[PDB]
Amino acid sequence: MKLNVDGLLVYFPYDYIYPEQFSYMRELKRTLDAKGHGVLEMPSGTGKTVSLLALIMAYQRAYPLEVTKLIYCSRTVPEIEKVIEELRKLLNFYEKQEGEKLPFLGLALSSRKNLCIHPEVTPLRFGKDVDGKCHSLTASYVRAQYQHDTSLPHCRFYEEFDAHGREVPLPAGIYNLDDLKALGRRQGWCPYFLARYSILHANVVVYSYHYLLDPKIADLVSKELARKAVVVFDEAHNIDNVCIDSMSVNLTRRTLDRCQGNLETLQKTVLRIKETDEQRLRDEYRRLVEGXXXXXXXXXXXXXXXXXXXXXXXXXXXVPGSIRTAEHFLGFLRRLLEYVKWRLRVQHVVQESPPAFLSGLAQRVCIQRKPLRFCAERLRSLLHTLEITDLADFSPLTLLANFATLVSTYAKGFTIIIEPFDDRTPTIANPILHFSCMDASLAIKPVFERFQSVIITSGTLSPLDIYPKILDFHPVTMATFTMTLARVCLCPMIIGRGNDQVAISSKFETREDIAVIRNYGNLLLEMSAVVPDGIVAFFTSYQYMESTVASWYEQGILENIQRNKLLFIETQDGAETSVALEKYQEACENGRGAILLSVARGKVSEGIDFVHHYGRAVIMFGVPYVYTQSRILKARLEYLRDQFQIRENDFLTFDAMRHAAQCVGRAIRGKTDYGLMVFADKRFARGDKRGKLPRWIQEHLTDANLNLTVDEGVQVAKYFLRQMAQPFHREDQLGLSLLSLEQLESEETLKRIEQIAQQL
Amino acid sequence: XXXXXXXXXXXXXXXXXXXXXXXXXXXXXXXXXXXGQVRLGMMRHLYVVVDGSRTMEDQDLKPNRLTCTLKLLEYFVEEYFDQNPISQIGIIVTKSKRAEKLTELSGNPRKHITSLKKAVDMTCHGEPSLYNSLSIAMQTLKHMPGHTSREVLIIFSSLTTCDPSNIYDLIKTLKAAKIRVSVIGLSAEVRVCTVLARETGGTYHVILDESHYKELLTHHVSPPPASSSSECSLIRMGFPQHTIXXXXXXXXXXXXXXXXXXXXXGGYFCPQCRAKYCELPVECKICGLTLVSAPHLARSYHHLFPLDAFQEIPLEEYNGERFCYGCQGELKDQHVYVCAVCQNVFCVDCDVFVHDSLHCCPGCIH
Amino acid sequence: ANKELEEKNRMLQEDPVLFQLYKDLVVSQVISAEEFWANRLXXXXXXXXXXXXXXXXXXXXXXXXXXXXXXXXXSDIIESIFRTYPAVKMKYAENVPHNMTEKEFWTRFFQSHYFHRXXXXXXXXXXXXXXXXXXXXXXXXXXXXXXXXXXXXXXXXXXXXXXXXXXXXXXXXXXXXXXXXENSNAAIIKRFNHHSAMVLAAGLRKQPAVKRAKLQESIEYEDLGXXXXXXXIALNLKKSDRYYHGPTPIXXXXXXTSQDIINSFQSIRQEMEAYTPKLTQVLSSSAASSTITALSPGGALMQXXXXXXXXXXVPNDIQSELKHLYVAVGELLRHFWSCFXXXXXXXXXXXXXXXXXXXXXXXXXXXXXXXXXXXXXXXXXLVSHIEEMLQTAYNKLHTWXXXXXXXX
Numbered sequence A: 001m002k003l004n005v006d007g008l009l010v011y012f013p014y015d016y017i018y019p020e021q022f023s024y025m026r027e028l029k030r031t032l033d034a035k036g037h038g039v040l041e042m043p044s045g046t047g048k049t050v051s052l053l054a055l056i057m058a059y060q061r062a063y064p065l066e067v068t069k070l071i072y073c074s075r076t077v078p079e080i081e082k083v084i085e086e087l088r089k090l091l092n093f094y095e096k097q098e099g100e101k102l103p104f105l106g107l108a109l110s111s112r113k114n115l116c117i118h119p120e121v122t123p124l125r126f127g128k129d130v131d132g133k134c135h136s137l138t139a140s141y142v143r144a145q146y147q148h149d150t151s152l153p154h155c156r157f158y159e160e161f162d163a164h165g166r167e168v169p170l171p172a173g174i175y176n177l178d179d180l181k182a183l184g185r186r187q188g189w190c191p192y193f194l195a196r197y198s199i200l201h202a203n204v205v206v207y208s209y210h211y212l213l214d215p216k217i218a219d220l221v222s223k224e225l226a227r228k229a230v231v232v233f234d235e236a237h238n239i240d241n242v243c244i245d246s247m248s249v250n251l252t253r254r255t256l257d258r259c260q261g262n263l264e265t266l267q268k269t270v271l272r273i274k275e276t277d278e279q280r281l282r283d284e285y286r287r288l289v290e291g292x293x294x295x296x297x298x299x300x301x302x303x304x305x306x307x308x309x310x311x312x313x314x315x316x317x318x319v320p321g322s323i324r325t326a327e328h329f330l331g332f333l334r335r336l337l338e339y340v341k342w343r344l345r346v347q348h349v350v351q352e353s354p355p356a357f358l359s360g361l362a363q364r365v366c367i368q369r370k371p372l373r374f375c376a377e378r379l380r381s382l383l384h385t386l387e388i389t390d391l392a393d394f395s396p397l398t399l400l401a402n403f404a405t406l407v408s409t410y411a412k413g414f415t416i417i418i419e420p421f422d423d424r425t426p427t428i429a430n431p432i433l434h435f436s437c438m439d440a441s442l443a444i445k446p447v448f449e450r451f452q453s454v455i456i457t458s459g460t461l462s463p464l465d466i467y468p469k470i471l472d473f474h475p476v477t478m479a480t481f482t483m484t485l486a487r488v489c490l491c492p493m494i495i496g497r498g499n500d501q502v503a504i505s506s507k508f509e510t511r512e513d514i515a516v517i518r519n520y521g522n523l524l525l526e527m528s529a530v531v532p533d534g535i536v537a538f539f540t541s542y543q544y545m546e547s548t549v550a551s552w553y554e555q556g557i558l559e560n561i562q563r564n565k566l567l568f569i570e571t572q573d574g575a576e577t578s579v580a581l582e583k584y585q586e587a588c589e590n591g592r593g594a595i596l597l598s599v600a601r602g603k604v605s606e607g608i609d610f611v612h613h614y615g616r617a618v619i620m621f622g623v624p625y626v627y628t629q630s631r632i633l634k635a636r637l638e639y640l641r642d643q644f645q646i647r648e649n650d651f652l653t654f655d656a657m658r659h660a661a662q663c664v665g666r667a668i669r670g671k672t673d674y675g676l677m678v679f680a681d682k683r684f685a686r687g688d689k690r691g692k693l694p695r696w697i698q699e700h701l702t703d704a705n706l707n708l709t710v711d712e713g714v715q716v717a718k719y720f721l722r723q724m725a726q727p728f729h730r731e732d733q734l735g736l737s738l739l740s741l742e743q744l745e746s747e748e749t750l751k752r753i754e755q756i757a758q759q760l
Numbered sequence B: 001x002x003x004x005x006x007x008x009x010x011x012x013x014x015x016x017x018x019x020x021x022x023x024x025x026x027x028x029x030x031x032x033x034x035x036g037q038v039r040l041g042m043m044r045h046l047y048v049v050v051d052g053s054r055t056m057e058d059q060d061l062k063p064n065r066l067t068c069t070l071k072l073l074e075y076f077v078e079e080y081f082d083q084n085p086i087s088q089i090g091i092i093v094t095k096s097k098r099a100e101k102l103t104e105l106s107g108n109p110r111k112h113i114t115s116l117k118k119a120v121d122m123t124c125h126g127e128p129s130l131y132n133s134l135s136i137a138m139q140t141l142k143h144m145p146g147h148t149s150r151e152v153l154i155i156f157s158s159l160t161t162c163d164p165s166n167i168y169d170l171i172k173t174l175k176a177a178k179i180r181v182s183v184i185g186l187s188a189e190v191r192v193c194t195v196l197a198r199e200t201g202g203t204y205h206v207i208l209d210e211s212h213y214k215e216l217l218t219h220h221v222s223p224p225p226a227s228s229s230s231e232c233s234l235i236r237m238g239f240p241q242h243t244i245x246x247x248x249x250x251x252x253x254x255x256x257x258x259x260x261x262x263x264x265x266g267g268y269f270c271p272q273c274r275a276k277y278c279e280l281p282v283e284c285k286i287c288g289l290t291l292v293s294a295p296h297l298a299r300s301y302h303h304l305f306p307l308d309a310f311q312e313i314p315l316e317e318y319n320g321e322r323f324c325y326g327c328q329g330e331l332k333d334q335h336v337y338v339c340a341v342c343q344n345v346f347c348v349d350c351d352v353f354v355h356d357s358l359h360c361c362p363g364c365i366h
Numbered sequence C: 001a002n003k004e005l006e007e008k009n010r011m012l013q014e015d016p017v018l019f020q021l022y023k024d025l026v027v028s029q030v031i032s033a034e035e036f037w038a039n040r041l042x043x044x045x046x047x048x049x050x051x052x053x054x055x056x057x058x059x060x061x062x063x064x065x066x067x068x069x070x071x072x073x074x075s076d077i078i079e080s081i082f083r084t085y086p087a088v089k090m091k092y093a094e095n096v097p098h099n100m101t102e103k104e105f106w107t108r109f110f111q112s113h114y115f116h117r118x119x120x121x122x123x124x125x126x127x128x129x130x131x132x133x134x135x136x137x138x139x140x141x142x143x144x145x146x147x148x149x150x151x152x153x154x155x156x157x158x159x160x161x162x163x164x165x166x167x168x169x170x171x172x173x174x175x176x177x178x179x180x181x182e183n184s185n186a187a188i189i190k191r192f193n194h195h196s197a198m199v200l201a202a203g204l205r206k207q208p209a210v211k212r213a214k215l216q217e218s219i220e221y222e223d224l225g226x227x228x229x230x231x232x233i234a235l236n237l238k239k240s241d242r243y244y245h246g247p248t249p250i251x252x253x254x255x256x257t258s259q260d261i262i263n264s265f266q267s268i269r270q271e272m273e274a275y276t277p278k279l280t281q282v283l284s285s286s287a288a289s290s291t292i293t294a295l296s297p298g299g300a301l302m303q304x305x306x307x308x309x310x311x312x313x314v315p316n317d318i319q320s321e322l323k324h325l326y327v328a329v330g331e332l333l334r335h336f337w338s339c340f341x342x343x344x345x346x347x348x349x350x351x352x353x354x355x356x357x358x359x360x361x362x363x364x365x366x367x368x369x370x371x372x373x374x375x376x377x378x379x380x381x382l383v384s385h386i387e388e389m390l391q392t393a394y395n396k397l398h399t400w401x402x403x404x405x406x407x408x
Ligand code: SF4
Pocket: A112, A115, A116, A117, A118, A121, A133, A134, A137, A138, A155, A157, A158, A189, A190, A192
């Protein structure tokens, strides 16, 4: 539908919109006029991906100067597939309207799990083993040995892509992972390296977060592309958690024992290759002395492992010290390994700053700072040198070498915390070593430096006052869009009152209180007896879901929940969860009642979305606090007190509410979807915790619904479902919660859309 | 706990009257009726599937749901045989994951209402079974002839739809067997009944009150319009005259009956097989002919040349015809209703009477 | 197999009137037993057209007691366990005498994995629990998620999954820390996952296509597209005057020439001017006396009607005779007019019509024999209605014969 969004025509790929839609489109015109970042909040009602891709395609169709390339970033591979197919719908609409005058290269991109063909690599199930066999079958040196012989191993895909495939760009076709694999089958190529080679020619690229924010993966979108690039994150609550997962490094005693075995293996390899060859070691010493390890770096496609984990602006251009002879570098890694192993021997929890660890190094095993920076460059050049094949075998030592880089680079923001035993362990032999970071800003800092205008957008983000206060961030637009409705469409209730008038809570900190778990089971039973077609029940921790569903069996509850609906409990297997989800979705459609109870942290509620009739009543059990984790929490909170200015009790409440309202706000797809969404404990009524739920849920949280009983909540659920199971046809929306062609041109509608959207 | 503050007062003498009048006016509503000049399914083997679930015993209605549902089905059988005479009804109670053909497909209200008066006394144990109930309704409704709009009405309450097999192959079969299934639902919307209703061709509805549930069953009394799929055949019909004992039984034919009977002297014959039937209309028990007295075709002629809308105007508005053209009375209220063709004057009583019972404008006859 | 015999018998027993009929037709030498039981298919599909699927609490509906180790006789429970756990089915194939009884076998059935939801080395259900674990590992390893096409693929819902090396939350799955109660609670989780999976699979009897299907389903919105309304074929009647004067035959309606309109308007405008005699003009008394003479029971308008002279002489046993006769001739004409109507122009249906002709002629012989054995008692009670029905069967048979011989 041909929108006027105050400067430009926009072909919306549906012949109807919401008003929330056009408010979002106004504010995103605002963010792309002035080159600034902006944080938006469209709730899950609209097609925010639909709108988002529509306006970015409108700018790229209308302005070939300011915006070169869209980099969408959605976090899970099914969301990659969804965003590609909505882009494909919009191109099909775009080509219905005009004809085959498209040229538009949509492109997904994930990994060698999902773009490899070869029938000996394909039956591997893991990412590192697929990377190892792809490093076996092609390299910089195995490819040359095949190039001057015949029977040496090769893929036939990368070789044929090397033969012809690097001169024909992909003509204007929006490609999924499946379509791209099919084109790799067709002419006979690698679609992995085709996708990476065709990053340069695309207009929309849709990959994951860790393919952009990791400094040791994202070396594939250069500066000149980034100066006119628009990056759009999507579902971006845990950006700070992605950063802290993206730069912290964990060392384990098993990692160090396999590092010792690796060190002996590489010592034997240096001995036998010293018996074999000498001339390329002379060339090694040349390209260390002469250059800065870039001699054979021009032809480097599959010879690249994970790069140096320092950021793009803190790397150096000097010569690697005393390291040069590989015998002495094995001695260097030997010293570093034995010192970190001796440091890990301490049988109490020890927190250090990284300069204290560097001084303990530089005093007690004589290793200085700059040869400890260049350890990543040295191990990558050495491991390229000695022709060795299966790099999965060398996963620990590279880890250790990469750990060395971080210890020798960053200070005052990061923290080296040593644990002799974990929290749920105590006194079992797992001494681990978190080089943990707590600057969230030091991983998105080159993302704001390089890129023009990055757009954090999610359905839930609250409060918006804190994402500039964590990410070292100053946006143009800080927008919240109010859910305008012609029908209530949702009701949140805070069931914080047992049927015995017992205060429902989780104050006990996972050590079971009996009557509260009793009232949780009573809530689940009676809400099962009311709600149709699938109830989703998020607990706090898997130990707590474990303990709760344990004491729902010895206590006589869970058979009654069986009598009403079919349970599908969760486990932390990767395949058992998928089978329980599949049976849960085959039981919401074959008549019976299905109820999926999970944990509000894991992968069950990150990508796997619950649409019109899969979850009607999202039961958020408890307030999700990170309670199991170590002094990483205390140290990140001490950091946010000190060098940012964010309180203890402010950040804990913010984190708990972003997880709770993250897991709740998936139930609703459109305006014609209705989701009961209950919150079950009293703490969600206490003003600060309720104050950090998003605006489109606080708008429909009535003071009567605030602190309901179990049975009052059940009767509100019954009245909700009965008032909201009637024919709510399209003719009930054209006034309020929908807009036609000609309902847009009225300036009264423009006054309405001015009144809907607000800023912070 | 403080509803007592709902009573305001401005002058307090007629202001409590205004609050009471606002409440008494907000405690009532009007129906929504639809008109169509479209083909209707007038021979109509409808087949009622009631729950006998555990959720029938819930007390959301003023008696438990079984009793209210069964009372309105007694009213439903009454009005459906009062309005469509050719058609038939069959009643299945669905109980304990199994389905029970409680009253076979017949066309007289005595047996059905007798069986519902019996079925007040039941137990309602177990979970229902939509598979087996649609299987029994399909099994009887395979072999009715193709011009019959074969319809099933599932008054369905519970949520666990405990089938013993796959119920999407039934919906594909019933899609191909051109049956039509409509579900009236209690307390919720269930996805499977929604797919069943939107795919077989029917309509799904959920219940607020007594009055809304009466409106839904009244909506399913009338013959629903046909798809582009149902056969438009020409059923061979028989019109047997009534025959008393000929001339004081001078060479009569003394029979018992044809379905505890006495000695029948005379009555209704059949023009195909020459049997003896007491009551008309009855499908021929030994021939397959359908026997019609033919006001039973005239009892449902109003569906074919239907009514129109009354132009409803409340105000005074030019009325030089002060009296009701219906029954010659004054219009002491502010609602005047004027027809389309003749454009005479009618009041509210004549409105409800013409549009519900007499089914014709008294002006357009003249 | 002697199935049919047992059916026709069971019926005859339960249905003595039908038995009667069966005798009055087969035993009376009119038709043969095989034909009668052959074309009389009217029964149920199965015991309930299916069974009762295991809803849930198949171990906890009337738990461990047909009144722990109480009695075990409930049919729903044993059939639902027979469907639900095929390991218990194979165990019932094995250890059923052959040295245990249902008391001891079901007492060894309320053991773990089945009633207590445990996981330990135990009695005779241990290998059955191991086979159930192998079935779970076959569903997880030899099988996977079928609709992992665009969602629900929980193993690979992360594009870059690594080991526990370079991460933050690497202490997720711990190879250490295996307790007793914790492993029991994980066992309860696994047994309920398997229990609900077996319920859903027992109630369900035995590529870019699926992926684009799930993508196009989860993307779309019901609001922003097309509507949901099927059609309504417009019935615009052509000739509605055929409805206005309906199936009433044309009465003699000949109003004469329109001169009479003017004459009658003149005479009745003159007539209704001078008016109201009330005493004089209304009734002469002789007309009233003749009217009372007429409405008296021997005059005109008293039609000598509502007489209804009946023949109630020997009621009861003749009524029983006529019940037998109308049941029998109803079955005969049932078969006749059921196969008769459409000619069904082939040789099998014509052969069934010839068998119907033979049954018809012998039916007429048996009806004449029954009339001779019945009506020769006290000389009353015309049975000639049954002879009218059978004479019309005779007539349709000869008329069809002449019609098909014209159609030769
Ligand atoms: S080179 Fe291509 S085909 Fe060979 S393993 Fe790598 S991705 Fe697979």
